[PDB]
Amino acid sequence: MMPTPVILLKEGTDSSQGIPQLVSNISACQVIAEAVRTTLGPRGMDKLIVDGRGKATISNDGATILKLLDVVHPAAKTLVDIAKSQDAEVGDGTTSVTLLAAEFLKQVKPYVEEGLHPQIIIRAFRTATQLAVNKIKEIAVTVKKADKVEQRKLLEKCAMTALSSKLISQQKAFFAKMVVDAVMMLDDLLQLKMIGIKKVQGGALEDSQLVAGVAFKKTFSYAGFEMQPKKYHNPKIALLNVELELKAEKDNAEIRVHTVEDYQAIVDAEWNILYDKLEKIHHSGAKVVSSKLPIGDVATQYFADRDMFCAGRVPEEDLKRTMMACGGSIQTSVNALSADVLGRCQVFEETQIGGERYNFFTGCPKAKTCTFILRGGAEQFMEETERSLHDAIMIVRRAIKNDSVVAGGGAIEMELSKYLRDYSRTIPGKQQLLIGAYAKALEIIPRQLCDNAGFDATNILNKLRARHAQGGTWYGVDINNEDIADNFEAFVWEPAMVRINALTAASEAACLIVSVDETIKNPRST
Amino acid sequence: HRPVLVLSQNTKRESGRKVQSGNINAAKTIADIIRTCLGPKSMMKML
């Protein structure tokens, strides 16, 4: 009843200010965190979310959950945007980052209600963040056994760990070995665009295969492609961007004829031009001819009578991979074809995996790409499998170039809280209530790694506190025995960068929330 | 139609500077009604 001037300042704008607005902003962050609280750890559960199309997605990755929640609260969006970054920078840093960032605010929530201006909180968050990050660098371990079985084992252990919290139980040795070896097929850019994953329905997880070469799905064909046998033991591959239709035109020409002699000559010329191109393709050995452009009926029969195979309408993404897989080049014009532009492989066959036809290439020793073929009993089943392969490849790619790893589980988070407590007990004044709050939030990881599957959370956390304060700092939470286990000796390792970036992103998220005092929402929304 | 779980349905609250200055502004507004009914040169009001 108060803002009732004779002339309004703006229009109809909502505005909140002060302590209830900060509490509301923190509360929104606590609620959105609920979407991932049960997804952490090897015994996390999956979520089923239905979109407006009626299609469900089943997943447990934070980078897929938070994007489907239809968040509108200005503050809750903060914990989503930081997931967008961690998806690129880290990969594993999804559920753990969201939960820690939310806890950073919960620990100070009971204090921000009664004074304690955010200006002092933000400075303490920055101090504690720098302390925690430096501590990781001082404890991470490396190896000196590069280009030996010791590095292969490191990468395999990184892959088997990366495959945790997926729809994977006994297939870790099956997928992990192929992920490590698939990446070693790449050049020294390790560009992920060189690894394809394709889903073929039918069969179990263990029936998947890693193909050194490429394959295409045999798209729209014409009458005559039931012919051309699919048995080749040493084919050459021509990748062309040439039109092989009779109706190919320049779209701007008109052929004006004044006599019958030229009438027939044009009719014959149109057929002769097509045959000229086909004869130039021949005499090359390119028994396999592929193009992104149509290949018409006349060419299909020409190739059949010449004992050649062709297939058109191949997407550019597969032609580029085919070029890199077969070791050749892609030529647009046929007027300059030679043996020096063709690809080569040993086996080219059309198989029937899952009932659908697939044309596989293999046998090229200079294959810079590969394709992993997934088999499964459902669309969603394979879709979740594909996601598990993308993360495992990402962790292995990074582990090859950065061998600095830390203990998994909550082992590092307990040591970080130990270091911060040792710091805080040497600092006088208000900082004791702020550095400690940062440290206390760090236990959300070993807590949730127990709450989602029992393990007597109260006492097993007390054990971690007793052990880390007296002995080693690599102790975490086992899954098989409901007690403490040494993650270092068990080789439960994660790249050091996962936690370093998690601390940075979680700290910045907190500073974005506590630094806001006012929210202004324009009324114009149509 | 499932309602929202609330307390004190259809009530309003105003607190803070909007009240501390609000109530004073209300007193300032009403005070002017008879501002011209003080001195010996007052004018008549027709109500």
Partner: protein, 535 residues
């Protein structure tokens, strides 16, 4: 609370939060298992030789009565995200193997049903899912222990015909129990590639025409198309066919590009009239010079061509479709010729008697080819007294063709009639107690679930499942485990070796593996976020 904060202000997190629903607990898990019971209760009614049929009424009013689970489950209007996955399970089995369209739903349902007690016992939902893997490995390993075959795919096709009889015995075509079993064997073995063990599905075409009876279904060593001779007085019988396959219309050649012929003088007008007449004569004589006596054209004919076809005694048909001229050229050993001027005798097809068949009062004029030369394609011609039995017959022969293909892919077989399922349940039970660390309850639940098949078979066979199961399971232990199953009429004894109940090894291996994986991906869920009303 949502839409109300402790300060009296609205509290809005997600768009239209008041129209959402979330319930996690154990209720998401019980809801998933309960919904699966509704699915299992449907398919259990069509299992076994007495399986009952379903009538499916489509959205447009069309009605078809079928037994094939692929046709039953694909026509559902169920708006439940997990029940939809139960349909995908039957699809994966149909695509890979093509047999167990009923079995994988009944088995997967039993695993979900038996799991219900395990949650109530306090066993972690994921530990249940993992426990099924430990038991499933036992059943799979023993499934491959008992297997033998004498099929060579040369002449000793007796067990191959028997396999087709086992599959067809569940369908509505038992009036042709033998006839269709023999058709299916002959259809595949005459086109299958013994070198790679591959069978190309495009080499067996299935056609049909309403009328007659199932007993009139024949296997034709050749192709059947819609015959329509362009000249109505053209003789309808060719004794020795020299077939020209042509993809060019019988009209004067035209360019593909913009032409716009300029005619100025009368000499130009009249001269063109002569030249065009000659084109009609040349295009026909170019066929006769090759010795051809039957032309089959993708395109139509001009009126001028039909007269020339008559005078040159050159029968031909018109507007034969893409896949029809493709199959004809392959079946007859010929090649498709682009143009008239490219015709040569070397590309002609060779075939025997060519005739068209008239059916009753109709004008269908269907092709029959009597003789062929080393054809690698066959056509099945299905008859029947109504539209429904013919469409079901198409699926009945499809299943018979699929299990033949499966034996070609892998010639290892097992004994059916429930013998494999009961034996697996007994094997898992024996190892379920080696060792009862945590998973004792889960491994026993798996063994019990395996029995859902001989129990449902017993119910549909009219037997009490307790009186039947207790006898067979005892007999398989008191003596060296015979291939002892169940049946409705008992046929004397239940020795599967004497009843010749044959099923494929790779079929059951997929049924166990695919059912187990489907159960896992729907147990490990505890949160469903489905939207409600639009506004």
């Amino acid at each position: 609370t949502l839409a109300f904060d402790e300060y009296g202000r609205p509290f809005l997190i997600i768009k239209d939060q008041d129209r959402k629903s979330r319930l996690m607990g154990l209720e998401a898990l019980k809801s998933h298992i309960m919904a699966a019971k509704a699915v299992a209760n449907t398919m259990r009614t069509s299992l076994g030789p007495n399986g009952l049929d379903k009538m499916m009424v489509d959205k447009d009013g069309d009605v078809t009565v079928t037994n094939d689970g692929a046709t039953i489950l694909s026509m559902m209007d169920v708006d439940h995200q997990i029940a939809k996955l139960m349909v995908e399970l039957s699809k994966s089995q149909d695509d890979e193997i093509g047999d167990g369209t009923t079995g994988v739903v009944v088995l997967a349902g039993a695993l979900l049903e038996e799991a219900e007690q395990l949650l109530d016992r306090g066993i972690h939902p994921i530990r249940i899912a993992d426990g099924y893997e430990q038991a499933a490995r036992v059943a799979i390993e023993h499934l491959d222990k008992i297997s033998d075959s004498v099929l060579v795919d040369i002449k000793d096709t007796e067990p191959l015909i028997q396999t087709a009889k086992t599959t067809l015995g569940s369908k509505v075509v038992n009036s042709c129990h033998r006839q269709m079993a023999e058709i299916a064997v002959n259809a595949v073995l005459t086109v299958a590639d013994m070198e790679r063990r591959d069978v190309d599905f495009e080499l067996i075409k299935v056609e049909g025409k309403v009328g007659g009876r199932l007993e009139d279904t024949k296997l034709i060593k050749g192709v059947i198309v819609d015959k329509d001779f362009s000249h109505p007085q053209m003789p309808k019988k060719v004794e020795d066919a020299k077939i020209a396959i042509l993809t060019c219309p019988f009209e004067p050649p035209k360019p593909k590009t913009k032409h716009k012929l300029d005619v100025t003088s009368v000499e130009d007008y009249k001269a063109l009239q002569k030249y065009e007449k000659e084109k009609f004569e040349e295009m026909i004589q170019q066929i006769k010079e090759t010795g051809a006596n039957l032309a089959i054209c993708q395109w139509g004919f001009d009126d001028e061509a039909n007269h020339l076809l008559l005078q040159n005694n050159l029968p031909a048909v018109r507007w034969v479709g893409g896949p029809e001229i493709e199959l004809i050229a392959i079946a007859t050993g010929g090649r498709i010729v682009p143009r008239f001027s490219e015709l040569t005798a070397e590309k002609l097809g060779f075939a025997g008697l060519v005739q068209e068949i008239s059916f009753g009062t109709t004008k269908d004029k269907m092709l029959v080819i009597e003789q062929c030369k080393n054809s690698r394609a066959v056509t099945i011609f299905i008859r029947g007294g109504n539209k429904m039995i013919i469409e079901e017959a198409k699926r009945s022969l499809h299943d018979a063709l699929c299990v033949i293909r499966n034996l070609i892919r892998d010639n290892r077989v097992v004994y059916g009639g429930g013998a494999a399922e009961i034996s697996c349940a007994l094997a898992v039970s024996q190892e379920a107690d080696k060792c009862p660390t945590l998973e004792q309850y889960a491994m026993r639940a798996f063994a019990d679930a395996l029995e859902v098949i001989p129990m449902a078979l017993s119910e549909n066979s009219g037997m009490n499942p307790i009186q039947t199961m207790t006898e067979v399971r005892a007999r398989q232990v008191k003596e060296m485990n015979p291939a002892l199953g169940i049946d409705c009429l008992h046929k004397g004894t239940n020795d599967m070796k004497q009843q010749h109940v044959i099923e494929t090894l790779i079929g059951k291996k997929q049924q166990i593996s695919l059912a187990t994986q489907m159960v896992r991906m729907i147990l490990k869920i505890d949160d469903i976020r489905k939207p409600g009303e639009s506004e």
